[PDB]
Design a protein around this ligand. Structure first.
Ligand SMILES: Nc1ncnc2c1ncn2[C@@H]1O[C@H](COP(=O)(O)OP(=O)(O)CP(=O)(O)O)[C@@H](O)[C@H]1O
Ligand SMILES: Nc1ncnc2c1ncn2[C@@H]1O[C@H](COP(=O)(O)OP(=O)(O)CP(=O)(O)O)[C@@H](O)[C@H]1O
Ligand SMILES: C[C@H](N)[C@H](N)CCCCCC(=O)O
Ligand SMILES: C[C@H](N)[C@H](N)CCCCCC(=O)O
Ligand SMILES: [Mn+2]
Ligand SMILES: [Mn+2]
Lengths: 224, 224
């Protein structure tokens, strides 16, 4: 299966919006797709247990019908760092459970997108970070950049750390988190020049519900 | 002279507030202090030319009476990346002018604090970043961390890049940019454990005008 990990320059830059776009483009290319969100914090109560909105978006944008727990094995109610709430609850986040889940998806899908939690270095326990599991799995990484002041520094910091870990930075996606501002074009030229990976496409600012929008058209899967 | 460069986990995390605290603690220890902001964007018009608020704060918290241009040689009106507005204006930001300015302060001060612009990787031209000048000057770096969700990842990214450049990370300052929230203590324990440099102190959330507040007491200069 092709496999990709999606990370962002910060929490709340549109990582689930860009993952849905990527999943829609892959389905359009003919792949049997599956989204995977191994760890999620910030969840609603339902009759079936906790459900996280990001994981629900990944589940409904996959071309296979998948069960919720297959998409998101670890679900925590409080929107904080996974390692704080895990210790609070007495539910260790296990690397073998995260990896087994990825293998299970690979039995049925041939294009799998894995979304992390927060940014690159999100702690999963006191001695283990998300970055450690991605390095362990040798996943190529797609960086989502919310275009806003401060994003050049965050995109370059994340790009260098990934490359120093010996991982492939597969490409980056520009996500317009605000309406058209004055230095949009110059910001896009600097980011193109400085991130050592192809620009896969730019998702425009979409006021109402962008994760349900049809955004696959903004992604050129040909560069991945 | 002792010399330190102050950087932040992002733009707007309280870097000028923590620089004023640091300058007030150094003056209290008996040092002849000078703040230096070589490059500033986001400036007001006055009868004397453009003046930047950060640079004004550094100038009024120094124990020597210094002229504005000595504190801030490059002043741009638009609050954007220095390299965009520099090219726009036809005013190159020169590394020799930035370094000469630091030497000039060193003729009169024995404790000099240098504040950068934005975060670590802020571009100054199309082939030169702020990080390149700090490496060139071999300045030890103090990291200011605004305590908010997403800050563990940004503090670790910045800490690793500085150390990979062979620079000393002298310490870090925790700045409380919001009122007391639910996971404050756990966030402070994780950041202490993960940043390989002493915690110099924590500045509390101060609603009204914190750069004019007397905040020197929150800094332990003894660890620098
Ligand atoms: N293209 C766009 N236009 C308008 N709003 C957007 C947008 N992209 C993202 N947003 C909005 O910004 C917020 C964050 O989006 P998203 O959930 O995709 O980011 P993220 O995955 O980085 C969050 P987390 O760190 O919890 O995973 C949402 O409210 C979303 O609808
Ligand atoms: N301890 C604190 N309590 C309340 N507000 C604070 C604060 N620290 C910073 N702020 C506020 O946050 C904003 C940013 O502060 P500051 O100017 O020191 O940050 P900064 O230097 O990172 C900005 P720039 O990137 O332009 O240099 C200001 O409005 C400031 O008063
Ligand atoms: C204007 C702002 N307040 C600071 N002076 C400069 C921030 C530059 C950020 C560059 C970037 O990383 O995107
Ligand atoms: C709750 C939030 N929306 C994401 N699920 C997780 C963000 C973890 C951030 C950890 C940190 O770097 O401070
Ligand atoms: Mn998300
Ligand atoms: Mn400042």
């Amino acid at each position: 299966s092709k496999r990709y990990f999606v990370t962002g320059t910060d929490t709340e830059v549109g990582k689930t919006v860009a993952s849905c776009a990527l999943l829609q483009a892959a389905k359009a290319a003919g792949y049997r797709t599956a989204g995977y969100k191994p760890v999620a914090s910030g969840s609603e109560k339902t009759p079936e247990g906790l459900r996280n909105s990001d994981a629900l978006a990944l589940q409904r944008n996959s071309s296979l019908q998948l069960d919720y727990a297959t998409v998101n094995p670890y679900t925590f109610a409080e929107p904080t760092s996974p390692h704080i709430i895990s210790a609070q609850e007495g539910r260790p986040i296990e690397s073998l459970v995260m990896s087994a889940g990825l293998r299970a998806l690979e039995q049925q899908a041939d294009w799998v997108l894995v979304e992390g939690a927060g940014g690159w270095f999100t702690p999963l326990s006191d001695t283990f970070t998300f970055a450690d599991w991605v390095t362990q799995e040798q996943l190529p990484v797609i960086l989502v950049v919310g275009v806003k002041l401060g994003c050049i520094n965050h995109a370059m910091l994340t790009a260098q750390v990934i490359q120093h870990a010996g991982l492939t930075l597969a490409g980056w996606v520009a996500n317009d988190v605000t309406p058209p501002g004055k230095r949009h074009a110059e910001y896009m030229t600097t980011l193109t020049r400085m991130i050592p990976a192809p620009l896969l496409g730019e998702i425009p600012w979409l006021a109402e519900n962008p994760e349900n929008a049809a955004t696959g058209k903004y992604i050129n899967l040909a560069l991945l």
